[PDB]
Write a protein that binds this ligand. Structure first.
Ligand SMILES: Nc1ncnc2c1ncn2[C@@H]1O[C@H](COP(=O)(O)OP(=O)(O)O)[C@@H](O)[C@H]1O
Ligand SMILES: [Mg+2]
Lengths: 241, 243, 233, 297, 250, 88
């Protein structure tokens, strides 16, 4: 239908185009996880291990946008890259404009506004990726802001994304009620990573190797990716179950 | 569907129908391979000789870029040649400004954004070539391949065109024999055999083998076509074992 | 497949072959026949000068582009024009700025590109005209074919337009003879006449219709007619 | 969990240290902790099914533990931790677990000991639903006998009934029947007859007629008599008992039919007179066996 | 489905009523029930918020954004159109009245400038109407408390009472029965809660309910005390706890 | 003969889920009546053809020993009533 194609309001008044973007962002099947520790923000994504024709390490879904701010991407790769530019770019420009490091909350707001402009542009087809910013924010400390392809955005205590998102959510919900707070337990940055690794394994039911994950960790003034072998230190106690 | 009659509409597929078609065209191009070695890269390509009226090694498919980036491409010849030419212009700006040769992943990114825009818009027809590129920059040797999708990744082997199937199988030996990659001189010989067995799938026309390399130990990390005696020798190795 | 997909340059068939491209080729088949060939030292184009009627003058289809350059058309007349003036422009820029005559090969890469821009674009015309370009640079004599696709190919000898069958066969046979022949303008020019007779249904052999051009390491680009082509006819 | 070399090393290893098993058995005497530790590491290798090879060394260990009045206390503790971790292939370990259970019955190492250990086991092994689940039922039947003596019979009955409503095809047909029937007897003692009646309904009556269930057939119908008779339902009593006589062993033998058929006469008359009564009583009339008794006749 | 004339916004519709504009209203309806009640001595605006995901934070979803410290807005509809429209409202107002007349707009003038933006996303072809219809409730000195609706068409109207969203029917009638302008503000807040309480009864907790007043100045929230003449903020947003107090007064 | 419940694979889970639905109200409508609910009749199965929805229907029927009538209606399909009227 022509009704499917028009960028301008659909007869329903809720776009077909928007529902479509939502389809897209589950083609790759990346289950990702982001939680807020006490003073640490853990992001984990499946690192696929393809054939030898590609290097496995190089393949990634976790990207360092700026200092403190990391981004996990869910949905197709070429569109991921397109989006990525604009966010890296603005963090720099804000620092020039305003002479201080950009806060997390403000970067997400900018990108919702760009998303909406896309459906007002006739030529342009709306980007069909999930941008979830994680950081140790300047004021607010651990912060999670998940951004939708449509352009809806909302903050999170914890979240997962994927087609199998549903299973992970339940564990995280019940956990937080027993713990009676919103932060994953232990001040220590190291053991919170391990509580995240473990909870990913449970929900999905599949044990993942160091090969099958990538672990990005937020501290004060850096976002950085751990070594392959760091992951293993956690994994080993857990792996016998 | 009407998504094939209006570019850059979000399909319920999640990828516009036209862009998909564009990929298919890569296959109609020639077996082109690339081999990542231990201190460089090799590019190798099957160039079908159309007729006796065609002129040896004068419309060579291998094209030089920068002074350290070796480039070859498969699919629409016109589309790719413009793309390679676009690529130099970008590299040019990079050199003036930052006074330094382009890193190979920098080069991939820049090209990546260019493709992306030209598919996100109705106005500009999607690109329909896959490009094998790389060489020896500052961070040493890399082999990357750029999908017309606009994905790119690092690789240790690349193969594309029709006869990629033959090619991938022969590339698996390389990795097992050496995680390093084979020695750059010895890999010239392996590369010829790969193109030649994959010309048993593209035998219907005659072909000429064209190899190039950018290797730190045998090229001083500048780009060069392998010609003359190394090239004629390479053909023999291949001919001898497929007998 | 009129309209729908493949009806505009942007829209792909599922396979991804533009039907329009083949039509642009058809324009060349409808076009005036021309046979081009070379030797290392000379490049010789022979073209039949089409005419409407007796009183209409036999019209040149070989166009001198530059002193050391020229082209011939087969296909759509408006397109050839926009392209030809561009050929001239580029050659002038290099001579002025960078000293050098524009090399024949390197001019072709640009020409390719220009054709592809109209294929990227919404609207515009992919050039629907094929051009045999001959030239004398510091690499000596060359002969290119420019396709409506864009592709430029260095060929010993080729022919485009109407009934190409007879002259192509003829060239394959005499391939070895005209490539060894160098240092002989007059003999290359003979080979080329003999070639165009095969293609034609003997429409004319008149001096009045055949126009022969030659550029090489010896002769500059000179257009030969009447008496000068009566030597070899 | 990637890597294939761990598979091979781990099996060979088990063999080496299973020849070395006497040193481990003997070490336990000096200290039970030194002996456990050697084996726990073997079974803690990253790949899964690393428990299966290694578990051969454990089969000989779980006997040593069972076989001293002190040592079975250490036994209860371990098996718990292994279960919590993953289960590590539900087959693998669980063959060992089941055998722990199998063992308590045969130990004869005092009523006290037996009671403690079962309460610990049954609770953990609730998770499983395969082979271990059959063996759970069987080992809970021990607590049920102990408690049957007591007034703690009411609590016991619930655990047993809760187990068998859950459908099993792991069990053979003869076995699933035996456990349900026992329940029905506990529910007689408890005073809940409608509970015994609900159970009865799921016990297919077709199955009993097959000849390997000839023994069960008698038992089930005897139990049914009990449910009706307290509640003065004389009509049902008659039917049951009639089906006892149609049991083929009973039918053949003079002695075995005699009290069965006498009991039917009493319950027919005891039912209020009317129409059911007529059609039933005249079946007996058809039948020369009641006429071979005379007081009855 | 509809005509190619009515999808176009450069083309007079047969009816003359665009299909487009009608789509914008279908979407308004689909959203939250938001209302406004005008009082002698205040305006109260109140709405329910989307429950969203369980672990999505509710606080960050804000359906009342202050345009200036003395004038707030409330909408029914989509988040994206809301935020973009909102940056445009403030920005155009600064240029045309905070530098020219070096002061905050009258409520009427601000409402006028918001309609114009709206109007342009309906005039220009290929740019859909704002997906949102507003209430702009506010206070200025000249014309006292004021209450408005601004339509995505770019027509605006003052009201005594209006409500929008699914529960618009219900709410409007309730306000009529129980209240008139001449009644005080304090009564209206209790009333508004009850009205919104018809809408949903599963949760009415002050977490999921955003309630604000534009009323009297707060010279505390002026924030540069020691100068009294400058008006404090007219708007004061009432916290969840404050809502709960107002629930036991109902 | 019962289609072997072992040789149903990857839908092991389906068999067990099913008897809740089917076995309890089929053998005794009594339990659901006392419980207080209208007894359930009408069950709709659905899966991409060749996952053995039919095969699963059979699997359950043998266990209970309940009588089994498999009627394909695609073998008797017609427009107006004819042969269908007789069969049903
Ligand atoms: N669960 C399964 N176990 C074994 N084979 C299977 C299974 N599911 C499908 N099949 C095979 O496919 C055949 C055809 O499917 P069929 O029973 O006609 O199912 P449906 O009604 O879903 O079309 C089955 O008879 C069986 O041979
Ligand atoms: Mg069927």
């Amino acid at each position: 239908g022509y009704d499917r194609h028009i960028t301008i309001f659909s007869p329903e008044g809720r776009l077909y185009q928007v529902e479509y973007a939502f389809k897209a962002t589950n083609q790759t099947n990346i289950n990702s996880l982001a939680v807020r520790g006490k003073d640490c923000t853990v992001v984990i994504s499946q690192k696929k291990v393809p054939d030898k024709l590609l290097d496995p390490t190089t393949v990634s879904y976790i990207f360092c946008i700026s200092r403190t701010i990391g981004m996990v991407v869910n949905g197709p790769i070429p569109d991921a890259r397109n989006a990525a530019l604009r966010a890296k770019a603005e963090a720099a420009e804000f620092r020039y404009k305003y002479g201080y490091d950009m806060p997390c909350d403000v970067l997400a707001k900018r990108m919702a506004n760009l998303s909406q402009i896309y459906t007002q542009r006739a030529y342009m087809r709306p980007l069909g990726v999930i941008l979830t910013f994680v950081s140790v924010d300047e004021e607010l400390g651990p912060s999670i802001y998940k951004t939708d392809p449509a352009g809806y955005y909302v903050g999170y205590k914890a979240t997962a994304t994927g087609p199998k998102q549903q299973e992970i959510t339940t564990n995280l919900e019940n956990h937080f009620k027993k713990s009676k707070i919103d932060h994953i337990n232990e001040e220590s940055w190291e053991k919170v990573v391990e509580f995240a690794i473990t909870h990913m394994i449970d929900a999905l039911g599949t044990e993942f190797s160091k090969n099958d994950l990538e672990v990005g960790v937020a501290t004060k003034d850096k976002f950085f990716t751990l070594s392959a072998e760091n992951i293993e230190e956690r994994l080993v106690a857990i792996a016998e179950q | 569907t009407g998504y094939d009659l209006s570019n850059s509409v979000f399909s319920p597929d999640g990828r516009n129908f036209q862009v998909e078609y564009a990929v298919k065209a890569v296959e109609n191009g020639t077996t082109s391979i690339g081999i990542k070695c231990n201190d460089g890269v090799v590019f190798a390509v099957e160039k079908l000789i159309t007729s006796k009226l065609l002129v040896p090694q004068k419309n060579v498919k291998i094209q030089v870029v920068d002074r350290h980036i070796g480039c070859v491409y498969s699919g629409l010849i016109p589309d790719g040649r413009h793309l390679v030419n676009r690529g130099r212009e970008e590299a040019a700006s990079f050199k003036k400004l930052y006074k330094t040769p382009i890193p190979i992943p920098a080069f991939a990114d820049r090209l990546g954004q260019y493709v992306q825009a030209h598919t996100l818009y109705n106005s500009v027809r999607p690109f329909g070539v896959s490009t094998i590129f790389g060489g020896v920059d500052k961070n040493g040797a890399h082999l990357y391949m750029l999908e017309p999708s606009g994905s790119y990744w690092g690789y240790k082997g690349a193969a594309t065109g029709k006869g990629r199937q033959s090619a991938k199988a022969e590339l698996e030996k390389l990795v097992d024999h050496h995680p390093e990659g084979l020695s750059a001189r010895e890999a010239v010989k392996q590369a010829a055999k790969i193109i030649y067995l994959a010309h048993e799938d593209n035998k219907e026309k005659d072909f000429e083998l064209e190899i190039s390399w950018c290797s730190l130990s045998e090229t001083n990390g500048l780009h060069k076509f392998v010609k003359g005696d190394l090239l004629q020798e390479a053909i023999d190795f291949a001919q001898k074992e497929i007998n | 497949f009129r309209n729908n997909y493949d009806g505009d340059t942007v829209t792909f068939s599922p396979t991804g072959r533009l039907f329009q491209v083949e039509y642009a080729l058809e324009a060349i088949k409808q076009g005036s026949v021309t046979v081009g060939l070379r030797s290392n030292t000379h490049a010789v184009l022979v073209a039949l000068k089409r005419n409407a009627d007796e009183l209409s003058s036999y019209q040149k289809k070989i166009i001198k582009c530059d002193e050391h350059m020229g082209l011939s058309l087969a296909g759509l007349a408006p397109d050839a024009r926009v392209l030809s003036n561009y050929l001239r422009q580029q050659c002038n820029y290099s001579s002025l700025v960078f000293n050098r005559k524009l090399a024949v090969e390197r001019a072709g890469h640009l020409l390719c590109d220009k054709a592809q821009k109209n294929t990227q674009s919404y609207g515009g015309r992919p050039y629907g005209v094929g051009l045999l370009i001959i030239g004398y640079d510091k690499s000596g004599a060359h002969l290119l074919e420019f396709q409506p696709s864009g592709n430029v190919t260095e060929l010993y000898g080729t022919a485009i337009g109407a009934r190409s069958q007879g002259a192509k066969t003829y060239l394959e046979r005499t391939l070895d003879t005209f490539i060894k022949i160098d240092g002989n303008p007059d003999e290359l020019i003979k080979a080329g006449v003999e070639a165009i007779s095969q293609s034609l249904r003997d429409e004319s052999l008149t001096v009045d219709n055949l126009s022969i051009a030659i550029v090489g390491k010896d002769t500059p680009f000179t257009i030969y007619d009447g008496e000068a082509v009566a030597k070899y006819i | 969990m990637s890597r294939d070399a761990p598979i091979k090393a781990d099996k060979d290893y088990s063999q080496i240290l299973k020849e070395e098993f006497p040193k481990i058995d003997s070490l336990a005497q000096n200290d039970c902790n030194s002996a456990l530790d050697q084996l726990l590491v073997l079974e803690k290798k990253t790949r899964q099914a690393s428990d299966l090879a290694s578990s051969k060394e454990v089969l000989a260990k779980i006997v040593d533990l069972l076989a001293s009045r002190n040592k079975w206390d250490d036994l209860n503790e371990q098996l718990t931790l292994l279960s919590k971790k993953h289960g590590q292939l539900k087959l693998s370990i669980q063959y060992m677990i089941q055998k722990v259970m199998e063992y308590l019955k045969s130990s004869k190492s005092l009523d006290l000991n037996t009671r403690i250990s079962v309460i610990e086991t049954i609770r953990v092994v609730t998770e499983n639903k395969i082979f271990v689940e059959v063996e759970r039922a069987r080992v809970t039947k021990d607590l049920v006998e102990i408690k049957k003596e007591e007034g703690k019979i009411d609590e016991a009955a619930d655990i047993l009934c809760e187990l068998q409503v859950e459908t099993y095809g792991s069990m053979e047909m003869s076995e699933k029947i035996q456990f349900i029937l026992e329940q029905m007897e506990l529910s007689i003692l408890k005073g809940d007859y409608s509970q015994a009646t609900v159970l009865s309904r799921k016990i297919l009556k077709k199955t009993f007629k097959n000849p390997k269930y000839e023994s069960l057939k008698l038992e089930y119908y005897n139990l049914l008599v009990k449910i009706s008779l307290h509640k003065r339902e004389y009509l049902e009593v008659a039917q049951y008992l009639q089906e006892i006589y149609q049991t083929d062993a009973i039918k053949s033998d003079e002695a075995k039919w005699k009290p069965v058929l006498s009991h039917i006469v009493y319950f027919l008359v005891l039912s209020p007179y009317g129409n059911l009564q007529n059609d039933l009583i005249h079946k007996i009339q058809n039948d020369n066996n009641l006429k071979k008794l005379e007081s009855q006749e | 489905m509809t005509d190619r004339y009515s999808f176009s916004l450069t083309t007079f519709s047969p009816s003359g009523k665009l299909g487009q504009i009608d789509y914008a209203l279908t979407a308004v309806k689909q959203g939250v029930t938001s209302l406004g009640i005008k009082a002698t001595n205040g305006v109260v605006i109140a709405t329910e918020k989307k429950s969203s995901s369980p672990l999505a934070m509710s606080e960050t979803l804000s359906k009342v954004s202050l345009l200036t410290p003395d004038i707030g807005a409330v909408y029914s509809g989509m988040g994206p159109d809301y935020r973009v429209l909102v940056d445009k409202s403030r920005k155009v107002a600064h240029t045309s009245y905070k530098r020219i007349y070096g002061e905050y707009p009258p409520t009427k003038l601000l409402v006028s400038e918001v309609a114009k933006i709206m109007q342009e996303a309906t005039q220009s072809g290929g740019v859909r109407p704002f997906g949102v219809s507003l209430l702009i409730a506010g206070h200025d000195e000249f014309n006292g408390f004021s209450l408005y609706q601004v339509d995505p068409s770019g027509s605006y109207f003052p009201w005594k009472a209006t409500a929008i969203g699914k529960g618009s029917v219900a709410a409007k009638t309730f306000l009529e029965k129980r209240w008139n302008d001449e009644l005080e503000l304090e009564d209206a807040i209790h009333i508004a809660l009850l009205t919104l309480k018809e809408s949903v009864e599963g949760e009415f907790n002050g977490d999921t309910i955003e309630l604000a007043i534009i009323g009297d100045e707060n010279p505390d929230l002026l924030g540069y005390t020691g100068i009294p003449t400058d008006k404090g903020p007219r708007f004061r947003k009432l916290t969840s706890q404050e809502i709960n107090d107002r629930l036991e007064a109902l | 003969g019962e289609i072997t419940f072992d040789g149903i694979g990857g839908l092991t889970e389906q068999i067990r889920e099913l008897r809740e639905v089917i076995e309890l109200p089929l053998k005794n409508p009594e339990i659901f009546q006392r419980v207080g609910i209208k007894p359930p009749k009408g069950v709709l199965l659905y899966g991409p053809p060749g996952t053995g929805k039919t095969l699963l229907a059979k699997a359950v029927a043998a266990t209970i020993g309940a009588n089994f009538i498999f009627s394909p209606a695609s073998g008797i399909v017609d427009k107006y009533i004819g042969e269908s009227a007789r069969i049903i």
